[PDB]
Amino acid sequence: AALLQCTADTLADAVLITTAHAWQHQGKTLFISRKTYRIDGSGQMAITVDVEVASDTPHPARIGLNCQLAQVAERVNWLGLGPQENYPDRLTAACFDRWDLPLSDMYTPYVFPSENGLRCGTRELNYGPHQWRGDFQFNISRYSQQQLMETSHRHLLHAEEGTWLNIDGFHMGIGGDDSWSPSVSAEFQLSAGRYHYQLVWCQK
Amino acid sequence: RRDWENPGVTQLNRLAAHPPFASWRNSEEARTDRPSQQLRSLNGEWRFAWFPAPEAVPESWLECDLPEADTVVVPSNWQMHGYDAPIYTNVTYPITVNPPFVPTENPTGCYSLTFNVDESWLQEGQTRIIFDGVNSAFHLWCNGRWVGYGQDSRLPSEFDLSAFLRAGENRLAVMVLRWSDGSYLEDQDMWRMSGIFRDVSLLHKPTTQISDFHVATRFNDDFSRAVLEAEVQMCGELRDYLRVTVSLWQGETQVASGTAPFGGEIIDERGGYADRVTLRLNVENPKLWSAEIPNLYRAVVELHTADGTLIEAEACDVGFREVRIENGLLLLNGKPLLIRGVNRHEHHPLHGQVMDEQTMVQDILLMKQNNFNAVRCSHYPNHPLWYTLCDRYGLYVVDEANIETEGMVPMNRLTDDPRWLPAMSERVTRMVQRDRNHPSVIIWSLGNESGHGANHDALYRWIKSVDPSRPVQYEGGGADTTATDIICPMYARVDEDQPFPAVPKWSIKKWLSLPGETRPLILCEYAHAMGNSLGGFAKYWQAFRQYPRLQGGFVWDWVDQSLIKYDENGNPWSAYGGDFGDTPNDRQFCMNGLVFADRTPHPALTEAKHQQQFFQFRLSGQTIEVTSEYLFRHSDNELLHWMVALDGKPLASGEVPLDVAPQGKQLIELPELPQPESAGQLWLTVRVVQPNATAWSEAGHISAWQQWRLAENLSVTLPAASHAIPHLTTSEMDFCIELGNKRWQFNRQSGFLSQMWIGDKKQLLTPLRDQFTRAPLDNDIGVSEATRIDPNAWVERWKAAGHYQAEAALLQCTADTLADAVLITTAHAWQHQGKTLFISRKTYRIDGSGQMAITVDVEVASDTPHPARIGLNCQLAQVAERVNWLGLGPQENYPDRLTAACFDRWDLPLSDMYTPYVFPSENGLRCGTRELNYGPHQWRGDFQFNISRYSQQQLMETSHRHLLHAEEGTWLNIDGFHMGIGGDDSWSPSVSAEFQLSAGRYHYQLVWCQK
């Protein structure tokens, strides 16, 4: 990430921060992320994300934000597709409702660890005193993507400090037509070039 | 009698049907196809009188002319001359359905002609008259004496006048009935006219003559050898000294020849045809005919005495080609075709149904220049010259019987009735007898929209029996009945099934594999091009290329059937159904063409051209793989032009000769390309150019193109800081912002940008507001009517949901001063009767540079019908001469109809930004635009837009383009999102789901600035 811009302004009833960052590799601009953060008198933080993806770069696995929360809570509650793990190209069986589960059910123990546990179509997510609202997909667990991608057997994974939260405006399908060649259908690739998403973080 | 009310009487004294004759008396003239002194045209000035019924015709007319008759040009349609009105009816019969009867009020055209006959024609042989087309039925008299009768408006009627003529001056009297029992078989979707609308000629033949002849070409397995077989029949004085000589020429070279006396092989216990002869010519390495290379030979058929006296000669162009279906594929010369076809009615905006060479040629050139290789004669045999032209220019043809009874209930009511078998059979049999020798005809068709009756089964078989060389097709009754060798649906969609009862229209890919099905599938009609349409067209082409057995189709249709009208000031204007006081009528349903009635293309034309390209391309790194879809030719008149541009700025370009064998591939590695550094998107465009002119195109013609995005360099460059900060002034009613010579005003009561000044000049006529509707397209409307609402049509769904009448309620409007800008924030709700349909939230950020960045977020109720578009609009004060944009173009293009458009920097006159479809609707959009320049303004983002002198409101409420009036200023429509236009059909919703605005939430952004 390269910062291109970081401003702060005060509005009548709110504070607005504006940021711009470019992601580059060996001199090429892969992605550009433009954001706004609006904190109002209600204490809600409104995040707006506008992203650009160079046309000649391969379509990314996802387009979201993430962080490691300090907190570790027992349950996860959301209003979205569930109750089980679901992805863009694998979400027909999931139902839109209000689900609540132990944090562990939010992690799928595939033997060969990877990205897992996503739930799509979520309008509201609750964890600890926090609440996020918008229209997004998410995963939350004690393992970072980093650890997962670095670990070959689930038995070697270890709970990190806190909780890793991945909240996606958009996520690539997972495929499976076969597992020895690219099998994700075109309509499931993040090839739009420009992506918009918005979320409200607040306390509950 | 009343022969015109008896399906049992279709002619009286009519001569047998036969291929085209000229009765040359010199073989070299026959060979050259020069005119024949024995074939006279009787076209020109005739005398004409209109009656409202045959009973009103005075008996004197037969013996002599009527003082009141007018002088008119023949061929012609009397309606065209104003005698009565043309009728525009689609399916419902223009008359009361009560076969076999017609109205007692039946417009009658009395035509006449005094002409001369040379004594010589009368001293020997036979003199006959030929009416190429008379609508719908007619009696004939010569010199006051009754000669005969005929029905079938679309095939020639020939009568022997030998005994009626006399040296010198003669007079014909032609009593033409507008309506007859034949009408019940002429219910095609077109203008209902009448008259002697094709050529009239006079032909001299000798007494002993060639009465018919059939030419066939059969090949060995690899087509290196062929046998030309010509069956010849004669009439007249049969004697031992007679012979027939058939010779075949390639240019001035005689490649083969055979002579034989008459007397065919024994065929049954009573012997053989002593009046027939079959000649067989072997031809080595024949040059094959195809739409790609219309190689022709000329066959001359000489009737003569064995000692050398030529009696007469007949002749035709011959195309060596084999047509067959094998293993479920339609093959031409052993290869599977891909029909880039079009349905074409014979129509002229001034002449009506009268055809002329110039027009035909013009259609043919346009068709070929647009990548079409086939035409279907919807829905009757065409003017004879048509065939000659397709043979020579090369287009595969579907020859169709003049049988359409769509108006019946059920549709097979007549075709399933044996009493109509005679009338039907004549329509089929005489067509085949006349057109069987033309190489261009590759498929026979049994007629159109007449259900499926046993009469069809019988005639199907008759054809298969008399002409084994061409498949027989027929859509009626479900498109896949036992009366068709090909599945030939009309409007079946690519992936979506429409399971009507009895005659479901399956998705074409699914259709092919139904249990037990094996035939090939060629849509007899698809992609209904009515008004702003052809959306989803590429979806068809993709399936056709992918499925071997999906072999193409014929677009509906070539030309709009609009008629010219003249105003109070005598200015021509395009009229449609009902414009002649004709009722009932099907209004604009008569206009479904790829080109306007004057041959001017509609934008859809270009989309068809591109999808129908003959070269396919793939890009790999720096290599271009070109793949030929030609079956028989090498790319011997083709070169490849390539060019790379960075956001419209040309960087590199070149030419490479194209050398690909039919069905072959060629790789082309491009030169090292520019590595810019500068922001923007690099685009590569390649074009296939014909360096040399052809019979149907000019040197330099472009036959194909394709584009690809290469590297993209995202701008990470921050703009320079401003020696300015805008000032905000407030009042209860507005927020006003100023920056230099620039000012913006926001109405606090409406919540919209109500005015802008550049300098001191106001820039807007109407405020900038959101817009969620469009002046509906013909496809949005479908068959909905004022009196007969079709609730399922898009337009009706939107009207009923209140989309067109929703009022924006202000939910919020605020102004805030920032460090280097003023920010206005708004939210509005659109409601109708209590229902919130849409919510629009925006921000307007004006900064120290003078730009205004507009951010919009819209929510659409999930339960409201998907809206036509999501955008903004406004009437600009300015009227500029030109429009410059960086986006898809240059022609009008929509979401589901933009593959042909190319991304570049385009620049056109205002007027080119409007498409004058006859029936007004949303039009002129250009999608994928990144920057738009008009007068002082510049707008940047990712959007689709439209700009013209007409408001959506105006378009919507006006019925004809000539009634449109330019408004003050320019109306601009700038959409973040726009719904597909559809077109699979024009009478049910046809926008594919992926082109519906069903996301719920939409986001878009623009920067409005000045230059």
Ligand SMILES: [Mg+2]
């Ligand atoms: Mg009759």
Ligand SMILES: [Mg+2]
């Ligand atoms: Mg003589």
Ligand SMILES: [Mg+2]
């Ligand atoms: Mg019809």
Ligand SMILES: [Mg+2]
């Ligand atoms: Mg000779």
Ligand code: NA
């Ligand atoms: Na792993």
Ligand code: NA
């Ligand atoms: Na095919």
Ligand code: NA
């Ligand atoms: Na029509």
Ligand code: NA
């Ligand atoms: Na070439």
Ligand code: NA
């Ligand atoms: Na209109």
